[PDB]
CSV table of N, CA and C in Angstrom, one decimal:
chain,number,residue,atom,x,y,z
J,22,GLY,N,65.7,-29.6,5.8
J,22,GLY,CA,65.2,-28.3,6.1
J,22,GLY,C,64.2,-27.8,5.1
J,23,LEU,N,62.9,-27.9,5.4
J,23,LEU,CA,61.8,-27.6,4.5
J,23,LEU,C,60.9,-26.6,5.2
J,24,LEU,N,60.6,-25.5,4.7
J,24,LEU,CA,59.7,-24.5,5.2
J,24,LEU,C,58.6,-24.3,4.2
J,25,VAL,N,57.3,-24.1,4.7
J,25,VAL,CA,56.2,-23.9,3.8
J,25,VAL,C,55.6,-22.5,4.0
J,26,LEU,N,55.4,-21.8,3.0
J,26,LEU,CA,54.7,-20.5,3.1
J,26,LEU,C,53.5,-20.5,2.2
J,27,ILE,N,52.4,-19.9,2.7
J,27,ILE,CA,51.1,-19.9,1.9
J,27,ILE,C,50.4,-18.6,2.1
J,28,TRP,N,50.0,-18.0,1.0
J,28,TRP,CA,49.1,-16.8,1.1
J,28,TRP,C,47.9,-17.1,0.1
J,29,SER,N,46.8,-17.6,0.7
J,29,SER,CA,45.5,-17.7,0.0
J,29,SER,C,44.5,-17.5,1.1
J,30,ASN,N,43.6,-16.5,1.0
J,30,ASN,CA,42.6,-16.4,2.0
J,30,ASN,C,41.4,-17.2,1.7
J,31,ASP,N,41.6,-18.5,1.8
J,31,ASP,CA,40.6,-19.5,1.8
J,31,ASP,C,40.5,-20.3,3.1
J,32,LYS,N,39.3,-20.6,3.5
J,32,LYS,CA,39.1,-21.3,4.8
J,32,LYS,C,39.7,-22.7,4.8
J,33,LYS,N,39.6,-23.4,3.7
J,33,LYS,CA,40.0,-24.8,3.7
J,33,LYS,C,41.5,-25.0,3.3
J,34,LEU,N,41.9,-24.1,2.3
J,34,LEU,CA,43.3,-24.2,1.9
J,34,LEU,C,44.3,-24.1,3.0
J,35,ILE,N,44.1,-23.1,3.8
J,35,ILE,CA,45.0,-22.8,5.0
J,35,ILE,C,44.9,-24.0,6.0
J,36,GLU,N,43.7,-24.4,6.3
J,36,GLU,CA,43.5,-25.4,7.3
J,36,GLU,C,44.1,-26.8,6.9
J,37,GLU,N,43.9,-27.1,5.6
J,37,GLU,CA,44.4,-28.3,5.0
J,37,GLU,C,45.9,-28.4,5.0
J,38,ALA,N,46.5,-27.3,4.6
J,38,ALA,CA,48.0,-27.2,4.5
J,38,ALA,C,48.6,-27.4,5.9
J,39,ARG,N,47.9,-26.8,6.9
J,39,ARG,CA,48.4,-26.9,8.3
J,39,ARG,C,48.6,-28.3,8.7
J,40,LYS,N,47.6,-29.1,8.6
J,40,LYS,CA,47.6,-30.5,9.0
J,40,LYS,C,48.6,-31.3,8.3
J,41,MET,N,48.6,-31.2,6.9
J,41,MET,CA,49.5,-32.0,6.1
J,41,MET,C,51.0,-31.7,6.4
J,42,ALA,N,51.3,-30.5,6.5
J,42,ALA,CA,52.7,-30.1,6.8
J,42,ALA,C,53.1,-30.5,8.2
J,43,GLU,N,52.1,-30.4,9.1
J,43,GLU,CA,52.3,-30.8,10.5
J,43,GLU,C,52.6,-32.3,10.6
J,44,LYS,N,51.9,-33.1,9.7
J,44,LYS,CA,52.0,-34.5,9.6
J,44,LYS,C,53.4,-34.9,9.2
J,45,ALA,N,54.1,-34.1,8.4
J,45,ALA,CA,55.5,-34.4,8.0
J,45,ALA,C,56.5,-33.6,8.8
J,46,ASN,N,56.0,-33.1,9.9
J,46,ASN,CA,56.8,-32.3,10.9
J,46,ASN,C,57.4,-31.1,10.2
J,47,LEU,N,56.6,-30.4,9.4
J,47,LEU,CA,57.0,-29.1,8.8
J,47,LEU,C,56.3,-27.9,9.5
J,48,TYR,N,56.7,-26.7,9.1
J,48,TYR,CA,56.1,-25.5,9.6
J,48,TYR,C,55.7,-24.6,8.4
J,49,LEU,N,54.5,-24.1,8.5
J,49,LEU,CA,54.0,-23.2,7.4
J,49,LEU,C,53.5,-21.9,8.1
J,50,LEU,N,53.6,-20.9,7.3
J,50,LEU,CA,53.2,-19.5,7.7
J,50,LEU,C,52.4,-18.9,6.7
J,51,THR,N,51.5,-18.0,7.1
J,51,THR,CA,50.7,-17.2,6.2
J,51,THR,C,51.5,-15.9,6.0
J,52,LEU,N,51.4,-15.2,4.9
J,52,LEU,CA,52.3,-14.1,4.6
J,52,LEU,C,51.6,-12.8,5.0
J,53,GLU,N,52.1,-12.3,6.1
J,53,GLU,CA,51.7,-11.0,6.7
J,53,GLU,C,52.9,-10.3,7.3
J,54,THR,N,53.5,-10.9,8.3
J,54,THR,CA,54.7,-10.5,8.9
J,54,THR,C,55.8,-11.5,8.5
J,55,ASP,N,56.7,-11.1,7.6
J,55,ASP,CA,57.7,-11.9,7.0
J,55,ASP,C,59.0,-12.0,7.9
J,56,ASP,N,59.6,-10.8,8.1
J,56,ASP,CA,60.9,-10.7,8.7
J,56,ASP,C,60.9,-11.4,10.1
J,57,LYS,N,59.9,-11.1,10.9
J,57,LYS,CA,59.9,-11.5,12.3
J,57,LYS,C,59.5,-12.9,12.5
J,58,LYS,N,58.4,-13.4,11.9
J,58,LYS,CA,57.9,-14.7,12.1
J,58,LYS,C,58.7,-15.7,11.3
J,59,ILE,N,58.9,-15.5,10.0
J,59,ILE,CA,59.5,-16.4,9.1
J,59,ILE,C,61.0,-16.7,9.5
J,60,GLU,N,61.8,-15.7,9.7
J,60,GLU,CA,63.2,-15.8,10.0
J,60,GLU,C,63.4,-16.6,11.4
J,61,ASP,N,62.5,-16.3,12.3
J,61,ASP,CA,62.6,-16.9,13.6
J,61,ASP,C,62.5,-18.4,13.5
J,62,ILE,N,61.4,-18.8,12.8
J,62,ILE,CA,61.1,-20.3,12.7
J,62,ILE,C,62.1,-20.9,11.8
J,63,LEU,N,62.5,-20.3,10.7
J,63,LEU,CA,63.4,-20.9,9.7
J,63,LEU,C,64.8,-21.1,10.4
J,64,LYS,N,65.2,-20.2,11.3
J,64,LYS,CA,66.4,-20.4,12.0
J,64,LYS,C,66.4,-21.5,13.0
J,65,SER,N,65.2,-21.9,13.3
J,65,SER,CA,65.0,-23.0,14.3
J,65,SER,C,65.1,-24.4,13.5
J,66,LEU,N,65.0,-24.4,12.2
J,66,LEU,CA,65.1,-25.6,11.4
J,66,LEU,C,66.5,-26.1,11.4
J,67,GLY,N,67.5,-25.2,11.3
J,67,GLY,CA,68.9,-25.6,11.3
J,67,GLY,C,69.6,-25.4,10.0
J,68,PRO,N,69.7,-26.4,9.1
J,68,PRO,CA,70.4,-26.3,7.9
J,68,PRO,C,69.8,-25.3,6.9
J,69,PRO,N,70.5,-25.0,5.8
J,69,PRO,CA,69.9,-24.2,4.7
J,69,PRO,C,68.5,-24.7,4.3
J,70,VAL,N,67.5,-23.8,4.6
J,70,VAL,CA,66.2,-24.3,4.4
J,70,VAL,C,65.6,-23.9,3.1
J,71,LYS,N,64.9,-24.9,2.5
J,71,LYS,CA,64.2,-24.6,1.2
J,71,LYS,C,62.8,-24.3,1.5
J,72,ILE,N,62.3,-23.2,0.9
J,72,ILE,CA,60.9,-22.7,1.1
J,72,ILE,C,60.0,-23.0,0.0
J,73,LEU,N,58.9,-23.7,0.3
J,73,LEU,CA,57.9,-24.0,-0.7
J,73,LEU,C,56.7,-23.1,-0.5
J,74,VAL,N,56.4,-22.2,-1.4
J,74,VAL,CA,55.4,-21.2,-1.3
J,74,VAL,C,54.2,-21.4,-2.2
J,75,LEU,N,53.0,-21.3,-1.6
J,75,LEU,CA,51.8,-21.4,-2.3
J,75,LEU,C,51.1,-20.0,-2.4
J,76,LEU,N,51.0,-19.5,-3.6
J,76,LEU,CA,50.4,-18.2,-3.8
J,76,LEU,C,49.2,-18.3,-4.8
J,77,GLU,N,48.0,-18.2,-4.3
J,77,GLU,CA,46.8,-18.2,-5.1
J,77,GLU,C,46.8,-16.9,-5.9
J,78,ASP,N,46.3,-17.0,-7.1
J,78,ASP,CA,46.2,-15.8,-8.0
J,78,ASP,C,45.2,-14.8,-7.6
J,79,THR,N,45.6,-14.0,-6.7
J,79,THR,CA,44.7,-12.9,-6.2
J,79,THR,C,45.3,-11.5,-6.7
J,80,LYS,N,44.5,-10.5,-6.5
J,80,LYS,CA,44.9,-9.1,-6.9
J,80,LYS,C,46.2,-8.8,-6.3
J,81,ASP,N,46.3,-8.9,-5.0
J,81,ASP,CA,47.5,-8.5,-4.2
J,81,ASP,C,48.6,-9.4,-4.4
J,82,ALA,N,48.4,-10.6,-4.8
J,82,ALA,CA,49.4,-11.7,-4.8
J,82,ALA,C,50.7,-11.3,-5.5
J,83,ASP,N,50.6,-10.3,-6.4
J,83,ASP,CA,51.8,-9.9,-7.2
J,83,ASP,C,52.8,-9.2,-6.3
J,84,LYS,N,52.2,-8.5,-5.3
J,84,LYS,CA,53.1,-7.7,-4.4
J,84,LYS,C,53.7,-8.6,-3.4
J,85,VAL,N,53.0,-9.7,-3.1
J,85,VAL,CA,53.5,-10.7,-2.1
J,85,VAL,C,54.6,-11.5,-2.8
J,86,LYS,N,54.3,-11.9,-4.1
J,86,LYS,CA,55.3,-12.6,-4.9
J,86,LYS,C,56.6,-11.8,-5.0
J,87,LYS,N,56.4,-10.5,-5.2
J,87,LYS,CA,57.5,-9.6,-5.3
J,87,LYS,C,58.3,-9.6,-4.0
J,88,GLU,N,57.7,-9.4,-2.9
J,88,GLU,CA,58.3,-9.3,-1.6
J,88,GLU,C,59.0,-10.6,-1.2
J,89,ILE,N,58.3,-11.7,-1.5
J,89,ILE,CA,58.9,-13.0,-1.2
J,89,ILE,C,60.2,-13.2,-2.0
J,90,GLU,N,60.2,-13.0,-3.3
J,90,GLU,CA,61.4,-13.3,-4.1
J,90,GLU,C,62.5,-12.3,-3.8
J,91,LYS,N,62.1,-11.0,-3.6
J,91,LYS,CA,63.1,-10.0,-3.2
J,91,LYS,C,63.8,-10.4,-1.9
J,92,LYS,N,63.1,-10.9,-0.9
J,92,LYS,CA,63.6,-11.3,0.3
J,92,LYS,C,64.3,-12.7,0.1
J,93,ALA,N,63.9,-13.5,-0.8
J,93,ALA,CA,64.5,-14.7,-1.1
J,93,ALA,C,65.9,-14.5,-1.6
J,94,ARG,N,66.1,-13.5,-2.5
J,94,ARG,CA,67.4,-13.2,-3.0
J,94,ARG,C,68.3,-12.6,-1.9
J,95,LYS,N,67.7,-11.7,-1.2
J,95,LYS,CA,68.3,-10.9,-0.1
J,95,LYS,C,68.8,-11.9,1.0
J,96,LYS,N,68.0,-12.8,1.4
J,96,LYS,CA,68.3,-13.7,2.5
J,96,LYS,C,68.9,-15.0,2.0
J,97,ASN,N,69.2,-15.0,0.7
J,97,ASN,CA,69.8,-16.1,0.0
J,97,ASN,C,69.2,-17.5,0.4
J,98,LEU,N,67.9,-17.5,0.4
J,98,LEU,CA,67.2,-18.8,0.7
J,98,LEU,C,66.5,-19.3,-0.5
J,99,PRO,N,66.8,-20.6,-0.9
J,99,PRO,CA,66.0,-21.3,-1.9
J,99,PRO,C,64.5,-21.3,-1.7
J,100,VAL,N,63.8,-20.7,-2.7
J,100,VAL,CA,62.4,-20.6,-2.6
J,100,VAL,C,61.7,-21.0,-3.9
J,101,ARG,N,60.7,-21.8,-3.8
J,101,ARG,CA,60.0,-22.2,-5.0
J,101,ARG,C,58.5,-21.9,-4.8
J,102,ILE,N,57.9,-21.1,-5.7
J,102,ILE,CA,56.6,-20.6,-5.6
J,102,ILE,C,55.7,-21.4,-6.6
J,103,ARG,N,54.5,-21.8,-6.1
J,103,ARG,CA,53.5,-22.4,-7.0
J,103,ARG,C,52.2,-21.7,-6.8
J,104,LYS,N,51.6,-21.3,-7.9
J,104,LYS,CA,50.2,-20.7,-7.8
J,104,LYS,C,49.2,-21.8,-7.9
J,105,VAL,N,48.6,-22.2,-6.8
J,105,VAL,CA,47.6,-23.2,-6.8
J,105,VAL,C,46.4,-22.9,-6.0
J,106,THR,N,45.3,-23.4,-6.4
J,106,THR,CA,44.0,-23.4,-5.6
J,106,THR,C,43.5,-24.8,-5.6
J,107,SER,N,43.8,-25.5,-4.5
J,107,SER,CA,43.3,-26.9,-4.3
J,107,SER,C,44.0,-27.4,-3.1
J,108,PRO,N,43.1,-27.9,-2.1
J,108,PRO,CA,43.6,-28.6,-0.9
J,108,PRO,C,44.4,-29.8,-1.2
J,109,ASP,N,44.0,-30.5,-2.3
J,109,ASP,CA,44.7,-31.7,-2.7
J,109,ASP,C,46.1,-31.4,-3.3
J,110,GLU,N,46.1,-30.5,-4.2
J,110,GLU,CA,47.4,-30.1,-4.8
J,110,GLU,C,48.4,-29.6,-3.8
J,111,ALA,N,47.9,-28.8,-2.8
J,111,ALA,CA,48.7,-28.3,-1.7
J,111,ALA,C,49.3,-29.5,-0.9
J,112,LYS,N,48.5,-30.5,-0.6
J,112,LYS,CA,49.0,-31.6,0.1
J,112,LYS,C,50.1,-32.3,-0.6
J,113,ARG,N,50.0,-32.4,-2.0
J,113,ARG,CA,51.0,-33.0,-2.8
J,113,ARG,C,52.3,-32.3,-2.8
J,114,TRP,N,52.3,-31.0,-3.2
J,114,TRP,CA,53.5,-30.2,-3.3
J,114,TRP,C,54.2,-30.2,-1.9
J,115,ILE,N,53.5,-30.0,-0.8
J,115,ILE,CA,54.0,-30.0,0.5
J,115,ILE,C,54.8,-31.3,0.8
J,116,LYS,N,54.1,-32.5,0.5
J,116,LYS,CA,54.7,-33.8,0.9
J,116,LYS,C,55.8,-34.2,-0.1
J,117,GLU,N,55.8,-33.7,-1.3
J,117,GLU,CA,56.9,-34.0,-2.2
J,117,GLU,C,58.2,-33.2,-1.9
J,118,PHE,N,58.0,-32.1,-1.1
J,118,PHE,CA,59.1,-31.4,-0.6
J,118,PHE,C,59.5,-31.9,0.8
J,119,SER,N,58.6,-32.6,1.4
J,119,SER,CA,58.8,-33.1,2.8
J,119,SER,C,59.9,-34.2,2.8
J,120,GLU,N,60.1,-34.9,1.6
J,120,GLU,CA,60.9,-36.1,1.6
J,120,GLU,C,62.4,-35.7,1.3
J,121,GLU,N,62.8,-34.5,1.7
J,121,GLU,CA,64.2,-34.2,1.5
J,121,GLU,C,64.9,-34.2,2.9
């Protein structure tokens, strides 16, 4: 049970992560609507799902980091956040979590 979340408004980061996660039969979401989209999909995974989050260091990123981790504790879901800007690094972190 591995879920991927990413909030970086880059054209290539988002697109690259989609393909790589899809390759390992994962699901990734951009952070805009959390409660409705994320819970629906994560509930479809089945077992206790571990969430791998990519948060690029942007101005707003601190509020999203806040909301993610607050909801992480609230919804008792294992979440690991990495601040990365790189399509290659993204592909790595995703795939290293895909092998669980």
